[PDB]
Ligand binder design. Structure first.
Ligand code: NAD
Ligand code: NAD
Ligand code: NAD
Ligand code: NAD
Ligand code: NAD
Lengths: 22, 331, 331, 22, 331, 331, 152, 22, 22
């Protein structure tokens, strides 16, 4: 439930499972 | 490397370190069979699922490479076991990881009905003030003495046996009904056994359900059977939601034939007090289907399920599997 | 026909049929020593009182014909025992009428702290909705496994022994501390005994109070002792309100040194969530001092107290009395 | 907690203990 | 009417009133397969037998009209189950009629080894006189304290579960070994489970046998395994005589590696102290295979066996049978 | 350096290392008060004694410097407590060192009477041979079923409470009689209490004695009371020999009113089967007063007694004593 | 019947001038009445009168016990009653005691001070045989303290 | 184990099972 | 109960309590 204040939503971290959500 | 998908989930911090050098892990976070990605339906070898999603025969036929399904838990009534066997799919589960957690939660609900504690705590938060002794006798009216009462159990399994041992320390008298057991099981534990469901309801002051949900016991507590119980009995349900007809239960609570009821599983989930046949029914206690959770239990069941997948990939089916439930139907 | 008065009460439907051909019954429904009628202070032979009124030496000197006081219950810390002996007044009580009722209520509070059930029920009524498994793990975060834990008991009396027997069926490890007992009591029950209070607090994961309120143990759980407990322990109090310093307890809950606390008796009564040092403290369960009530227990204790009065009137003091607590001080 | 709607509060029934409440 | 024969017996006072209007009852009082009358071998439909006679495949082929065999008891290791199925003969037994009698007898033998009582009584009859305290410490040398010891059980069946519950009240620590059980059975009863036989013997101070005599466990306690036990352990056997090699046991008792042994069943019966490998072995207790007898148990098992015959005659095989053990092999 | 004497004993290997730098140790190995050396009667400060020697008022007056007597055990009925107080002598004992050893021995005797095991073992050594089932039913005739029976206990002390807990695991129904206890002790343990000795004997199938030998209960089981027991009851005695009249017990066994009896203490010791009123009485089990011995228990009680002497010498009487039994009578 | 269904006492109260109008007043003046069915009746001495009482008491639902040491075996089988062997056992399990024995020299003051304490809490007592079988001094104390509910 | 002193061992009582012992 | 074959019953070892038996 941690608030996602990730303003600069970049993708320099591929750290885990592959997200295949639709 | 093959692909393994978590059908309904987002967190995979425990399974990832195990299945990292033998397969590829992915998650879908789906809520229905129509929300599964097309890649999963074509390139999936194994799957992991909780109790929040139901698979039918039509859903199973859409998979083209599935070989094994592992259920994280003890219940598998949401999967068509017989149909999966014909298609050549094996089904596994974790038999006993939360036996003692569920038994303790059942005893907690029983004590709340006799020694009213949740209702007394709720009254104080609403602003009720009690000062004199006469006021105390009125707010807590209905409490009873446990010793000398009779407890009825339907289904003497792993959880059923655990509850029976703990109930004898409080002075209860224990009966049980189970038609699939052998002879002399009650002799070892020193219990009493009946032969018909009607006989159990006639001589019981509190009824608890611990059986499984097969196709011969849907709506076991129906309208006809609910009238065979005693005047002013209790009812505890922590096994499955399909065993109780909620429409008939609501009428019994209003008329006063049933003093109270504690429920942990419901026909329709998630549960809300403002919707359903139980919208306005007195003397009701409900929990959000969390009679199994524990810090140690959660980690134990997730690690065991992950290791079951690894054995299947690096072995043979179903020789290498430990807990297989459709071995007879498998071809 | 002598006069017998009920100091704090209005209902006398049980005592009247017994004391109708030997005395005259009356009630005062008083809340303080200043609300007692003048006729009672001059023409009263016996009296009956609950725990809601306190009598001191100055109050006792105002009576001119009192000879016996009978306390409906097991505690007599609200009456000056030594002072009444000098004036020539006998004090009686009902020793054991709700031993098993109080023991069952203590076990109910213990299970609520481990298997969170009152808090989960409260959340649903506030409108919280939980659907996914991740949401379930968050709302019910904090539940633990009972087996393997250590339970500490302070005072092994009638209630203390009853709790110990029931706690062993769940897998607890039981210790106790009592400096007024003889040697070998733990051998019979198969328990473990310590010699100092500090040693008990160091090795306990849950502490329950079952001692009496004498003059050597006021504020037993004070500021200094509350810092000797483990990190993240529980606390249950159902004996008396004067054994715990509520000001120090509130700070411990906020900082997180104590995971939770269940209370049935408080320093100031009646209790309200909007007043007192515990106005805003997380993880708190409270009940309105009703750990003794039962349909059978209420009738049993009222009849026994009435028959104690009749023996004193038609006999000799204190030869005819069965439960006298100030026999040594009586002159 | 029964509501006392005893409008004609008469005293034709002396049925119990003597009330000495102040 | 058909003929029913009792192979090894003379008394038929209980079975006669039941099987009098449906069949003809007869007895043979035979001690071997060569003492059966010729009429029985040609005109017998059913038979009743105790544990004193053994039937092989050659013996079964001599019968020309046999259809059902009922064993009065719980063990059927003296009948070739697989061979009887091919010939078209059904085998039945009484599963649980002396569960509690056997469990009580097992506990009696355990207490005699720790608190020496049979040996002390035997010494007095021989004329031994003890007066001083020093003499008392010498005649009763070897007694130990029960609390804190470890008890090992081989086979957790009906009798095995009954023994485990009673042993916990004395302070024992219980382990068990069973390779044919499912997962989580120990969770319900709160016991501890091991995976290998060698591990059980390493950490046990007293070993009890409660398994069955199949073809994979003949001479389970052989010469090699008896050297893996602890220094100065006990041994109790009440299941079957073929599970223990008596030749190796005698040497262990003499050298002192085993402190004592209590036996109820032996390889060769009847047992005599003057014959066999155990002719001169210290610290031995023996009983004449009577761990099942009781006034109520004897009547119950004889009536149940008689009613099983009547259902087969006036019904269909094996649909009307309740306890059939060769249903899979039956053709 | 003062002198400490062991009145009846020869071995002092445990007490010597403790009392070597504060006193001088000596032993007498006496069997009567007339075999005490003259030096002891004049220069003895403390003494240690077992149960084999009795001291009266005349014997106590012969000592000129005795100040303390320590009894190694729990019983002190062989010392005149009141007379020693007037002369200024303190008496001490070891209250609880063999509580569990005595409780286990009591249960062993109870099981031998129901499940005949000592008698069956004795028969085999005499040369009896049993082969057929009919012979088995005859040699072991008399065994009964434990579940459903009623157990009566006289005196609920340390040992009495231990026996009650263990007896409930076998299915017994427990009653007790004790006139010196408070109210509600049975509520904690969940037992049933009677008010008269006659009522206990009417509704009991097995009677066990666990009381003390004061001056108001000599020959408690006399001729008149032995006729109030049921037809075919048992009797177990392990407390003291003076509570049972052996002359009346022998007649009951012969006529058949009492099925059996197990005795550990007798009026005259040492016991011999060829002498006394019980010379020829069927169904009798006897042990040589060794229901307390254990390897751990023997060392524990001897060390505690030695340290009690050292505190008295290097302290003040009776402030430094922990277990004093004549404090009220001491002047 | 007068002890269970209070009738003499209710009639006596009316003549003294007591007035009862409301239902609450009725429950107070007639407080103490009980239900006959399910109770136990104890009889001491099964003679001519004793047998007649036993037959009539069974029609009301009583449970009948008796104690008589001078009778033969099987007398209770014919009448379908229950028999005890000691006087103490009869007093422990009885809610109403009636005396129908004779006054010989071995039963003077049969209901003495010691035996009156062995009866149940709140029992009745009826005596119509002889006056020497009951110690009136001990009976008076029992009535005042409340151990005996009533006596005829 | 009752001693069989049935001196006049006659057969005027056929009361039970058929004895087929060899 | 150890047999005392202490033929040369000398007293070169005073090792324990004082024996005051009569
Ligand atoms: N958090 C939760 O709510 C939770 C957690 C765990 C298990 N459960 C449920 O608990 C139930 C019992 O689990 P278990 O481990 O004891 O199961 P189990 O399979 O070990 O035993 C189930 C027992 O039910 C008996 N039974 C089956 N049909 C019956 C019928 N019609 N009438 C009576 N008895 C019948 C079976 O013979 C067996 O004895 C399951 O439904 C399981 O899904 C719920
Ligand atoms: N509804 C309620 O809240 C309720 C109901 C009943 C009793 N109680 C309270 O429960 C308490 C215990 O009742 P009980 O019947 O078990 O009492 P009890 O008198 O039978 O036993 C009390 C025990 O406390 C021990 N003790 C005294 N001071 C002690 C100290 N400083 N430290 C440790 N132990 C000490 C005594 O030695 C004794 O063993 C009483 O305070 C009683 O008033 C509360
Ligand atoms: N009077 C007597 O001596 C007497 C009386 C009754 C029964 N018995 C004997 O008691 C034994 C047990 O009876 P029960 O009713 O408990 O039997 P059961 O069939 O109910 O249970 C037997 C158990 O043994 C286990 N087992 C089988 N082979 C094993 C092996 N190699 N190692 C470990 N465990 C193994 C099984 O899995 C099962 O759990 C039987 O041999 C029976 O004949 C003796
Ligand atoms: N090896 C042995 O034979 C052995 C060993 C230890 C103790 N004992 C004997 O066991 C007995 C009990 O020991 P304990 O430690 O339980 O004693 P305890 O003093 O702790 O308890 C004795 C109990 O007896 C009760 N009592 C006294 N007089 C009674 C009477 N007339 N009727 C009924 N109850 C009565 C007391 O009130 C008390 O409850 C003692 O006589 C002791 O000497 C024998
Ligand atoms: N108006 C009256 O008050 C009145 C009228 C008639 C008779 N009675 C009295 O009624 C009594 C009974 O008359 P009945 O005709 O039935 O007498 P009965 O002689 O026919 O029978 C008397 C019975 O008392 C039994 N009995 C004797 N001693 C006993 C004892 N110690 N304990 C128990 N039972 C004992 C006898 O064995 C016998 O069964 C007599 O005392 C008689 O005088 C009173």
């Amino acid at each position: 439930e941690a608030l996602d204040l990730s303003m600069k939503s970049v993708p320099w971290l591929k750290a885990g499972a592959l997200d295949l959500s639709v | 490397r093959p692909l393994v998908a978590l059908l309904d989930g987002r967190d995979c911090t425990v399974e990832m370190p195990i299945l990292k050098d033998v397969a590829t892990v992915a998650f879908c976070d789906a809520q229905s069979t129509q929300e599964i990605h097309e890649k999963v339906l074509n390139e999936a070898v194994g799957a992991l699922m909780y109790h929040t999603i139901t698979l039918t025969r039509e859903d199973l036929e859409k998979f083209k490479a599935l070989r094994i399904i592992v259920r994280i838990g003890s219940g598998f009534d949401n999967i068509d076991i017989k149909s999966a066997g014909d298609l050549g799919i094996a089904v596994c589960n974790v038999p006993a990881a939360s036996v003692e957690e569920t038994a303790d939660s059942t005893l907690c609900h029983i004590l709340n009905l006799y020694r009213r504690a949740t209702w007394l705590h709720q009254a104080l938060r609403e602003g009720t003030r009690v000062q004199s002794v006469e006021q105390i006798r009125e707010v807590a009216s209905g409490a009873a003495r446990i010793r000398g009462e009779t407890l009825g159990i339907i289904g003497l399994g792993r959880v059923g046996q655990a509850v029976a041992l703990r109930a004898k320390a409080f002075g209860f008298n224990v009966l049980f009904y189970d038609p699939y057991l052998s002879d002399g099981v009650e002799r070892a534990l020193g219990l009493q056994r009946v032969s018909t469901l009607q006989d159990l309801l006639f001589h019981s002051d509190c009824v608890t359900l611990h059986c499984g949900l097969n196709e011969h016991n849907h709506h076991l507590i129906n309208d006809f059977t609910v009238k065979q119980m005693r005047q002013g009995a209790f009812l505890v349900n922590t096994a499955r939601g399909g065993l109780v007809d909620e429409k008939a239960l609501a009428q019994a609570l209003k008329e006063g034939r049933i003093r109270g009821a504690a429920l942990d599983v419901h026909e329709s989930e998630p549960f809300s007090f403002s919707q359903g046949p139980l919208k306005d029914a007195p003397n009701l206690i409900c929990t959000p289907h969390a009679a199994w959770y524990s810090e140690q239990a959660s980690i134990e069941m997730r690690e065991e399920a992950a290791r079951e997948i690894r054995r299947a990939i690096t072995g043979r089916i179903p020789d290498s599997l430990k807990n297989c439930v459709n071995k007879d139907h498998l071809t």
